[PDB]
Amino acid sequence: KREHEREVIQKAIEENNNFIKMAKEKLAQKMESNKENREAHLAAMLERLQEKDKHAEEVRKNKELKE
């Protein structure tokens, strides 16, 4: 009986720690995946605007090479 009582309290500690562990890890994966996605959505927007400057350079270039 004493050994059984020891096992029950250990089970309870183990499950409470597992819940804390797993909540800590799911949250950290979520905050990481989110930072990455936000960043990739911004990098893509900035790249699209980068291609607009590259097209405007090329258009001014195309003007001057005509007289």
Binding site: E7, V8, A12
Partner: protein, 428 residues
């Protein structure tokens, strides 16, 4: 053997426990100071059973008060007889047990139990000859029930040759705090069946019905219920406390009352049934005491005695009366109703008389029966347990403290075994 160590656990345990010490203290002439101020010598002859003498000459209850919450123990300490208890015998945690057997038995109670056993050891060591232990608790909550049965297991390990007895309050939906009471009660019974020698079943169903139907109290409080409990308790411990021939210690009571080790759950009865404060003026005749004490309506466990058979009965008559008339009336009951007393235990009804009546009555009778009808009590709890347990309802309160469903399954099966074991002897 002389000394009994008393343990009261949880809200119910400590509330009935305080009333018990109040009632027996008045009978032994002890006042709130711990000072004797009585006339008779019968009062002091066996005072050592329940009281320690510490020079004064003052009398200190051999009583340990246990809870996981401080609330009810502060109530006791500033209560009427509050000053009498040894302050070191107050053992409390802070966090409570939330009506949860698993918290009392496995998590919160485990944290507190060693401190209780230190106080038990300290009391046990001052004893010439410890008889054993009595515990007052309920089965429906978490502390009295879960921690109370933890304590019993640990007391049995450290004192395996001592008698363990309980006054156990069984829950009822009629007077109920939580839905989990049947879970807590089933888990507790499983323990009681293995680790006590004798258990007085105090049924909150019965106490409610007596208050409602018989005492004409339209809304019973705990106070009203406890008045019946403290009268029954005073009655069942009379032969332990006063000079007397039979059932005079805890082991002799067990030997006469318990024919098979598992069947040790007793139905107490009391007569006359009185309410608090309001006095009765006409004393009862010996024939009236004897008829009322055996009446289902005077039973403290809601079981119909005509639905089973009596294995053994102890009867205690209190007051100045005719012992010849007692023998005759006691003999009359048995001869009139002989089919209700098992024929394979000869002379299974024993009677004691004590001269000292309880406060406020000139005559009283207390009944202790080992009937196979007690099975009705366990069937009722079993039904309530299964209604929930088949949908596993409310179980998360228990698995959250480390328990598996298996433990519930085992506790249920053992209680069903007890039921069918009673049915075995009701038909033999």
């Amino acid at each position: 053997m002389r000394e009994i160590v008393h343990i009261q656990a949880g809200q119910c345990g400590n509330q009935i426990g305080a009333k018990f010490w109040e009632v027996i203290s008045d009978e032994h002439g002890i006042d709130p100071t711990g000072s004797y101020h009585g006339d008779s010598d019968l009062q002091l002859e066996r005072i050592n059973v329940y009281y320690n003498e510490a020079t004064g000459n003052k009398y200190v209850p051999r009583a340990i008060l246990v809870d996981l919450e401080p609330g009810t123990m502060d109530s006791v300490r500033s209560g009427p007889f509050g000053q009498i208890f040894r302050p070191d015998n107050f053992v409390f945690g802070q966090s409570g047990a939330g009506n949860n057997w698993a918290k009392g038995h496995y998590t919160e109670g485990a944290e507190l139990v060693d401190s209780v056993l230190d106080v038990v050891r300290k009391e046990s060591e001052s004893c010439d000859c410890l008889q054993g232990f009595q515990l007052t608790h309920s089965l429906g909550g978490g502390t009295g029930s879960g921690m109370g049965t933890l304590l019993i297991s640990k007391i049995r390990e450290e004192y395996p040759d001592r008698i363990m007895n309980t006054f156990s309050v069984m829950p009822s939906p009629k007077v109920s705090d939580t839905v989990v009471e049947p879970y807590n009660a089933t888990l507790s019974v499983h323990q009681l069946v293995e680790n006590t020698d004798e258990t007085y079943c105090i049924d909150n169903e019965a106490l409610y019905d007596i208050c409602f139907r018989t005492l004409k109290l339209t809304t019973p409080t705990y106070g009203d219920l406890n008045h019946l409990v403290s009268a029954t308790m005073s009655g069942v411990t009379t032969c332990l406390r006063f000079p007397g021939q039979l059932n005079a210690d805890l082991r002799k009571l067990a030997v006469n009352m318990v024919p098979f080790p598992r069947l040790h759950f007793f139905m107490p009865g009391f007569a006359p049934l009185t309410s608090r404060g309001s006095q009765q003026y006409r004393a009862l005749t010996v024939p009236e005491l004897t008829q009322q004490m055996f009446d289902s309506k005077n039973m403290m466990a809601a079981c119909d005695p005509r639905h089973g058979r009596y294995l053994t009965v102890a009867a205690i008559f209190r007051g100045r009366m005719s012992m010849k008339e007692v023998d005759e009336q006691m003999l009359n009951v048995q001869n009139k109703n002989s089919s209700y007393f098992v024929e394979w235990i000869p002379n299974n009804v024993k009677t004691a008389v004590c001269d000292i009546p309880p406060r406020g009555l000139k005559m009283s009778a207390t009944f202790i029966g080992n009937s196979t009808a007690i099975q009705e009590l366990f069937k009722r709890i079993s039904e309530q347990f299964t209604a929930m347990f088949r949908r596993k309802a409310f179980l998360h309160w228990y698995t959250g403290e480390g328990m598996d469903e298996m433990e519930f399954t085992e506790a249920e099966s053992n209680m069903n075994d007890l039921v069918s074991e009673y049915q075995q002897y009701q038909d033999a």
